Amino acid sequence: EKRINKIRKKLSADNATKPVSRSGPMKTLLVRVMTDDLKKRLEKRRKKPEVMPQVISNNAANNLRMLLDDYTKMKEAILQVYWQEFKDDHVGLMCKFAQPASXXXXXXXXXXXXXXXXXXXXXXXXXXXXXXXXXXXXXXXXXXXXXXXXXXXXXXXXXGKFGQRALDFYSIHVTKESTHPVKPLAQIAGNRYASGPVGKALSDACMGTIASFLSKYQDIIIEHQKVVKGNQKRLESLRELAGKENLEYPSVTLPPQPHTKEGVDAYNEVIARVRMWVNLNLWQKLKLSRDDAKPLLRLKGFPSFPVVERRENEVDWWNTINEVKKLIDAKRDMGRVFWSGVTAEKRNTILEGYNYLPNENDHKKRENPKKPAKRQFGDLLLYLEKKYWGKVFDEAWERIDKKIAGLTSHIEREEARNAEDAQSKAVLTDWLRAKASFVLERLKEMDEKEFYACEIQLQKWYGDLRGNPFAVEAENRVVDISGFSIGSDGHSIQYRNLLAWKYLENGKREFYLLMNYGKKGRIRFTDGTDIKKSGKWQGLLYGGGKAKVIDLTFDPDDEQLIILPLAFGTRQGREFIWNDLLSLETGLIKLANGRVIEKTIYNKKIGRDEPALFVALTFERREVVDPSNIKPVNLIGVARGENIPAVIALTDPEGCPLRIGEGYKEKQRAIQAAKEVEQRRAGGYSRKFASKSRNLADDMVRNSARDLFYHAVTHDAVLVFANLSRGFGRQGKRTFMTERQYTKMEDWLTAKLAYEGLTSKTYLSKTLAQYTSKTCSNCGXXXXXXXXXXXXXXXXXXXXXXXXXXXXXXXXXXXXXXXXXXXXXXXXXXXXXXXXXXXXXXXXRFSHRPVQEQFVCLDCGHEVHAAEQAALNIARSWLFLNSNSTEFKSYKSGKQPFVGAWQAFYKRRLKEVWK
DNA sequence: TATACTTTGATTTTCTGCTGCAGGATGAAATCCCG
DNA sequence: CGGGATTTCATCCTGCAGCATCCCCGACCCGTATA
RNA sequence: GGCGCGUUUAUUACUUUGGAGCCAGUCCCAGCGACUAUGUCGUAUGGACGAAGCGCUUAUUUAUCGGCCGAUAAGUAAAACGCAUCAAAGUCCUGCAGCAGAAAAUCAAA
């Protein structure tokens, strides 16, 4: 009773249905094309198929290569010419992509006392439902709608929404007229692809991409205007250094608002220089806390123009290896006169301060730990200093040169045979960096002028040599299928693609995808109804608004007609090809769009270089359940977290009364530990678990969304989430992006709720997260007053005591926190409390949740899991918000804050009906 | 009893993945060549 | 002069919403051994 | 960690997550540790080599038993079957950015 398709057949089989209004919910297939290895997978089994289905016929693959390669070339040409348009005039291209308005009317005016940003910002009281005042500027009425007031209500020059079809791309490059000199269908594709579907799909893709770039660029220009205003407001760093008299000058002026991309680089360079100076001379040598001298923020978020502005820094491995060896062996003789020279004492400071000699690598936890190869050279230097300082350099150089020669001979004999050693490359780079950072100490002692030039060259070479043998080339290749429609004259296929389903022997089908992107016809159709055991080839082409299957006649020929046999499960087909509730060939689902994707999938037998072929037909729904349900006895309190996500508590409607996805952080910590142990040695990543964590996270999100949806439906309940303010994450030091999923569960639950009809007003509600997980379920904050008296505060709720136990660690520490309290209390206590952060002791002992699972109250003496207790607080916080009893009249009139009003609701209802 | 050592700040060079935004999920109609 | 291939052309969405919620680090980076 | 079966997720074969099944050694290269130090000994860290279910029918080769072949142990090869072995999920594309991981430099804090 706990599968997902049982719940959708519980929803869609107890109340009525209704058609959609304008658009619908979208799903997508992701079927794979049966090339050859999908048939090798079939002739390897125990039971074997009756009909060994089909294979890509070795000519369809060649024209797919031609089509995808021509498509990406045309995309790069269009994006390069609009990049050259964008670098010449920002606001011109922004005004080009604005939109048309609609089919409006004779709206209002605001010419006087209202201009623009970059020319007659009019107005209209559009929707009279609950929100009007749409500005919608003109002179093509560009729907400008902005002005966030604050200091000046200035409306945005370009519109509130950049658009896809604003430019009329099919009046430019693709048409035979219009002497714009860049024509992709003519110059690049060689005039052999049809200028119908190719030009319009390429239009849709390129214009959607530049619309997304401009729609990000406008907001980023606005937010960098705010950040540069705040950063000009934060040059009291010059005020403090004169205020403390200890520092002379930073000597740096800020540029204006950058606006290009390289201005952002110069601006953030100056910001980094000032920030490094502030950390070096104010945060450390003068011991100032961060939140007294606020630092300069960095301009982050500036987008780049999409495809053309990528890096492509590709270099070959052995040539850079020989370059590092050339730089090392050039300066060998100058290193000999240096290390045989100056002192014993200064040279010991070089050997000890620059991390050569091993500090504590002897802690043998059942063999020593390994050394980072700048310290193995230190051990060899120590042994040669004992046994043998001029000729120590020669023996050290010969030994490390023999190690280097053995490593490069092993990599040459293993790389150029069949495979990649994949770890000894990293060790060769580490030992080369060690030889470099041993040779360079003439320059790090004599003159630091040219020392930094060779250092940044060696840093670039080391970064190349460690990262570039693990970089992935060969990004995905997509072509689009923009719609399935019969033309105006009812005998044609506009966009020239179909879902075929040639009939097999008994009753089953084959389900090809037919593409005809050449400059010809080659597909025709009338109608049919027979079911004979041959190529009925039917089709589903969506005539007008109606859905119609056809009888289709064509011959497989090597000029056009990409014929892709699909491969999918019974699950995907049962879901949205032949679903017995939402059938095709009736119109309850309709196909909308399609692709063809050549992406790199992982094949286990070799490395990941196995590009497969997926299709991805995307579908829109047209039959939708009408909301006439209530969910009264409901209040399922979804309380989310990173350790255990989605903790569940179910109540009654008055408020009186599961750990979905329990073991989850351990699994991703194990995957992360595998990535980290494969990253330290063997400097890259080993591209096998390059999608393991995303697949685990997706499986958890979708299984937990299934479980939340199940417990919502079968117990006649409404889920109650907390307003986590999307984008919510811990965002610290050891905080991986794979456990930031407080938004993803809500997104997937809405996506399974938007599909199959419903909205976020019948099974999903959201309440405020203020002071949940903090109030005990039989008791009542964050204003822990330490103003009460050093021996023992008595608090508000009755009386307390002292005698603590603070377990502060991150080293080797623990405390009883009373003797230290008396030591920090001095005597007169006022001077103590002025000069103590010893409130941290009380806030570490007397706090709720000492360990980050449990909970301890301060007047109940109660122990709860603080996740079931958080869930009950969520399910009662929503019951407090929209129930006007007495106390929600307060906090809307502004009488009390939220805390006292919620406590007065809670302890009144805790004695009344225990809620 | 301090001097030796440790983790952590801030710049920088290379790569990776995962989320978080923004575009989207094109049918209808009208011209126009062409043999 | 109809068939088939190009060219244009354009469509809707309103909402109100206030400081913690996730985790955990700080705290003491001063401490601590030990020569 | 590696290698294979395949069931349920009310026409097909896809991408995944689980459960269960069987094998995880050799110093040949390299790493790393100790030093009797331009090397010797260890350590399975990485490449390379092999290890990767069982049972029932049918043809055979070898060893046992029987006075042309018959029945056992092993091995070969084939097809079909059974058991170990059992449940779930899928909404994608494009493009940027932001975080985090990983070493590696430089300048400092106590």
Coordinates of C-alpha atoms in Angstrom, one line a residue, chain A residues 347-622:
Chain A
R347 CA 70.0 27.8 7.1
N348 CA 68.4 26.0 10.0
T349 CA 65.7 28.6 10.0
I350 CA 65.2 28.0 6.3
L351 CA 65.1 24.2 7.0
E352 CA 62.7 24.6 9.9
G353 CA 60.4 27.5 9.0
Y354 CA 59.7 26.4 5.4
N355 CA 58.3 23.0 6.6
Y356 CA 61.2 20.8 5.5
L357 CA 62.1 18.8 8.6
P358 CA 59.4 16.4 9.9
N359 CA 57.7 17.9 12.9
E360 CA 55.6 15.1 14.5
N361 CA 55.4 12.1 12.1
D362 CA 56.2 9.3 14.4
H363 CA 52.7 8.5 15.9
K364 CA 52.6 4.9 14.6
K365 CA 49.0 3.8 14.9
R366 CA 49.9 0.2 14.1
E367 CA 54.7 2.0 10.4
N368 CA 55.0 5.8 10.4
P369 CA 52.5 8.0 8.7
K370 CA 53.5 9.2 5.2
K371 CA 55.2 12.5 4.5
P372 CA 54.3 15.1 1.9
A373 CA 57.5 14.7 -0.1
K374 CA 58.8 18.1 1.0
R375 CA 59.7 16.3 4.2
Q376 CA 61.1 13.1 2.8
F377 CA 63.7 15.4 1.3
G378 CA 64.1 16.9 4.8
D379 CA 64.8 13.4 6.2
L380 CA 67.3 12.7 3.4
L381 CA 68.9 16.0 4.2
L382 CA 69.1 15.2 7.9
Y383 CA 70.6 11.8 7.3
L384 CA 73.2 13.3 4.9
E385 CA 74.0 16.0 7.4
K386 CA 74.7 13.3 10.0
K387 CA 76.7 10.9 7.9
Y388 CA 78.4 13.5 5.8
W389 CA 77.8 20.6 4.1
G390 CA 79.1 21.3 0.6
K391 CA 79.1 17.8 -0.8
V392 CA 75.8 17.0 1.0
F393 CA 74.1 18.9 -1.9
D394 CA 75.6 16.7 -4.5
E395 CA 74.5 13.4 -2.9
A396 CA 71.0 14.8 -2.3
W397 CA 70.7 16.1 -5.9
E398 CA 71.9 12.7 -7.3
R399 CA 69.5 10.7 -5.2
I400 CA 66.4 12.9 -6.0
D401 CA 67.4 12.9 -9.7
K402 CA 67.5 9.1 -9.7
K403 CA 64.1 9.1 -8.0
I404 CA 62.8 11.5 -10.6
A405 CA 64.3 9.4 -13.5
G406 CA 62.7 6.2 -12.1
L407 CA 59.3 7.9 -11.7
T408 CA 59.4 9.3 -15.3
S409 CA 60.6 6.0 -16.7
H410 CA 57.7 4.2 -15.0
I411 CA 55.2 6.7 -16.2
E412 CA 56.6 6.5 -19.7
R413 CA 56.4 2.7 -19.7
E414 CA 52.9 2.6 -18.3
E415 CA 51.2 5.6 -19.9
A416 CA 52.4 4.6 -23.4
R417 CA 51.4 1.0 -23.2
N418 CA 47.6 0.7 -22.5
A419 CA 46.6 2.6 -19.3
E420 CA 47.3 5.4 -16.8
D421 CA 49.2 4.9 -13.6
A422 CA 47.1 7.8 -12.2
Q423 CA 49.0 8.1 -8.9
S424 CA 52.7 8.1 -9.8
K425 CA 51.9 11.2 -11.9
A426 CA 50.9 13.0 -8.7
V427 CA 54.0 11.8 -6.8
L428 CA 56.2 12.9 -9.7
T429 CA 54.6 16.4 -9.6
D430 CA 55.0 16.5 -5.8
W431 CA 58.7 15.6 -6.1
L432 CA 59.2 18.1 -8.9
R433 CA 57.6 20.8 -6.8
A434 CA 59.9 19.8 -3.9
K435 CA 63.0 20.1 -6.1
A436 CA 61.7 23.5 -7.3
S437 CA 61.0 24.7 -3.7
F438 CA 64.5 23.5 -2.9
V439 CA 66.3 25.3 -5.8
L440 CA 64.4 28.6 -5.3
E441 CA 65.8 29.4 -1.9
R442 CA 68.6 31.4 -3.4
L443 CA 65.9 33.8 -4.7
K444 CA 63.8 33.6 -1.5
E445 CA 66.8 34.9 0.4
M446 CA 68.8 37.1 -2.0
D447 CA 66.2 39.1 -4.0
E448 CA 62.4 38.6 -4.0
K449 CA 61.9 40.5 -7.2
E450 CA 62.2 37.7 -9.8
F451 CA 61.4 35.1 -7.1
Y452 CA 57.7 35.8 -7.4
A453 CA 57.7 35.6 -11.2
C454 CA 59.2 32.1 -11.2
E455 CA 56.9 31.2 -8.3
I456 CA 53.7 32.1 -10.1
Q457 CA 55.0 30.3 -13.2
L458 CA 55.7 27.2 -11.1
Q459 CA 52.3 27.5 -9.4
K460 CA 50.6 27.6 -12.8
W461 CA 52.7 24.7 -14.0
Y462 CA 51.9 22.7 -10.8
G463 CA 48.2 23.5 -11.1
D464 CA 48.2 22.3 -14.7
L465 CA 50.2 19.2 -13.9
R466 CA 47.8 18.2 -11.0
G467 CA 44.4 19.2 -12.5
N468 CA 44.7 18.8 -16.2
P469 CA 45.1 15.0 -16.2
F470 CA 41.7 14.8 -14.5
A471 CA 39.8 17.5 -16.4
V472 CA 36.9 16.2 -18.5
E473 CA 36.5 17.4 -22.1
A474 CA 33.6 16.4 -24.4
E475 CA 30.5 18.3 -23.1
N476 CA 27.1 17.1 -24.1
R477 CA 25.5 17.6 -27.5
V478 CA 21.8 18.3 -27.8
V479 CA 19.5 18.8 -30.8
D480 CA 15.9 20.0 -30.2
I481 CA 12.6 18.7 -31.5
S482 CA 10.4 21.8 -31.2
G483 CA 6.9 20.4 -31.3
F484 CA 4.8 17.7 -33.0
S485 CA 2.2 19.3 -35.3
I486 CA 0.5 18.8 -38.6
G487 CA 0.8 21.9 -40.8
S488 CA -1.9 24.2 -42.1
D489 CA -2.6 22.0 -45.1
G490 CA -3.5 18.8 -43.2
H491 CA -1.0 16.6 -45.1
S492 CA 2.6 17.5 -43.8
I493 CA 4.7 17.1 -40.7
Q494 CA 5.8 20.4 -39.3
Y495 CA 9.1 20.0 -37.4
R496 CA 9.4 16.5 -39.0
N497 CA 9.5 14.1 -36.1
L498 CA 7.3 11.4 -34.7
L499 CA 6.8 8.6 -32.2
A500 CA 6.4 5.7 -34.7
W501 CA 5.6 2.3 -33.0
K502 CA 6.1 -0.2 -35.8
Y503 CA 4.0 -3.2 -34.8
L504 CA 5.7 -6.4 -33.9
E505 CA 4.4 -10.0 -34.1
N506 CA 1.7 -10.5 -31.5
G507 CA 0.4 -7.2 -30.3
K508 CA 3.4 -5.3 -29.1
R509 CA 5.2 -2.2 -30.6
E510 CA 8.7 -1.0 -31.4
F511 CA 8.5 2.7 -30.6
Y512 CA 11.0 4.5 -32.8
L513 CA 11.6 8.2 -33.0
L514 CA 11.7 9.4 -36.6
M515 CA 13.6 12.5 -37.6
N516 CA 13.6 14.1 -41.0
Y517 CA 15.8 17.2 -40.6
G518 CA 17.0 17.0 -44.2
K519 CA 15.8 19.4 -46.9
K520 CA 13.1 17.1 -48.3
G521 CA 9.9 15.3 -47.5
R522 CA 10.3 11.5 -47.2
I523 CA 7.4 11.0 -44.7
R524 CA 3.7 10.8 -45.6
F525 CA 0.5 9.6 -43.9
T526 CA -3.2 9.3 -44.2
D527 CA -5.1 7.3 -41.4
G528 CA -5.6 3.7 -40.4
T529 CA -7.1 1.3 -37.9
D530 CA -5.7 -2.2 -38.6
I531 CA -3.5 -4.1 -36.2
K532 CA -1.7 -6.5 -38.6
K533 CA 1.6 -8.0 -37.6
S534 CA 3.9 -5.7 -39.8
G535 CA 4.9 -2.1 -40.2
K536 CA 1.7 -0.3 -39.4
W537 CA 4.1 2.5 -38.4
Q538 CA 1.3 4.6 -36.8
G539 CA 2.6 7.9 -35.5
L540 CA 0.5 10.3 -33.1
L541 CA 0.9 13.7 -34.7
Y542 CA -1.5 16.1 -32.9
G543 CA -3.6 17.6 -35.6
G544 CA -4.9 21.1 -34.7
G545 CA -5.8 20.6 -31.1
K546 CA -6.9 17.0 -31.3
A547 CA -4.6 14.0 -31.0
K548 CA -4.6 11.7 -34.0
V549 CA -2.8 8.5 -34.9
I550 CA -2.3 7.9 -38.6
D551 CA -1.1 5.3 -41.0
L552 CA 2.3 6.3 -42.1
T553 CA 4.3 5.1 -45.1
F554 CA 8.0 5.5 -45.7
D555 CA 11.1 3.5 -46.6
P556 CA 14.3 3.4 -44.5
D557 CA 16.9 5.2 -46.7
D558 CA 20.4 6.6 -46.3
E559 CA 19.7 10.2 -47.2
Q560 CA 17.5 11.3 -44.3
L561 CA 15.2 9.6 -41.8
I562 CA 17.0 9.2 -38.5
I563 CA 15.3 6.2 -37.0
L564 CA 16.0 5.8 -33.4
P565 CA 14.7 2.7 -31.5
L566 CA 14.1 3.6 -27.9
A567 CA 14.8 1.5 -24.9
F568 CA 12.8 1.9 -21.7
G569 CA 11.2 -0.1 -19.0
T570 CA 7.7 -1.3 -18.3
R571 CA 7.6 1.4 -15.5
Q572 CA 8.3 4.4 -17.8
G573 CA 5.8 3.1 -20.4
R574 CA 3.2 2.3 -17.8
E575 CA 3.7 5.8 -16.5
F576 CA 3.4 7.9 -19.6
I577 CA 3.2 6.1 -22.9
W578 CA 0.4 3.6 -22.4
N579 CA -1.0 4.6 -19.0
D580 CA -4.5 3.1 -18.5
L581 CA -5.8 6.2 -16.8
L582 CA -4.1 9.0 -18.9
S583 CA -4.0 7.5 -22.3
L584 CA -2.4 8.8 -25.4
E585 CA -4.4 8.8 -28.7
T586 CA -7.1 10.5 -26.7
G587 CA -5.4 13.7 -25.6
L588 CA -5.2 13.4 -21.8
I589 CA -1.5 13.6 -22.1
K590 CA 0.1 15.4 -25.0
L591 CA 3.6 15.4 -26.2
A592 CA 5.1 18.8 -26.1
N593 CA 8.8 18.9 -27.0
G594 CA 11.8 16.6 -27.5
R595 CA 15.5 16.4 -27.6
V596 CA 18.3 14.1 -28.6
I597 CA 21.2 14.2 -26.1
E598 CA 24.6 12.7 -26.6
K599 CA 26.1 12.8 -23.0
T600 CA 29.0 10.9 -21.5
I601 CA 27.7 7.9 -19.5
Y602 CA 30.0 5.8 -17.3
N603 CA 30.9 2.4 -18.7
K604 CA 32.6 0.2 -16.1
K605 CA 34.9 -1.8 -18.4
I606 CA 36.9 1.2 -19.5
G607 CA 37.0 4.8 -18.3
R608 CA 34.0 7.1 -18.6
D609 CA 34.6 7.9 -22.2
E610 CA 31.4 6.2 -23.5
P611 CA 29.0 8.8 -25.0
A612 CA 25.5 7.3 -25.1
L613 CA 22.3 8.5 -26.8
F614 CA 19.2 9.6 -24.8
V615 CA 16.1 11.0 -26.3
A616 CA 14.0 12.9 -23.6
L617 CA 10.5 13.4 -24.9
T618 CA 8.8 15.9 -22.6
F619 CA 5.0 15.6 -22.0
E620 CA 2.3 17.9 -20.7
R621 CA -0.7 16.8 -18.8
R622 CA -4.3 17.8 -19.7

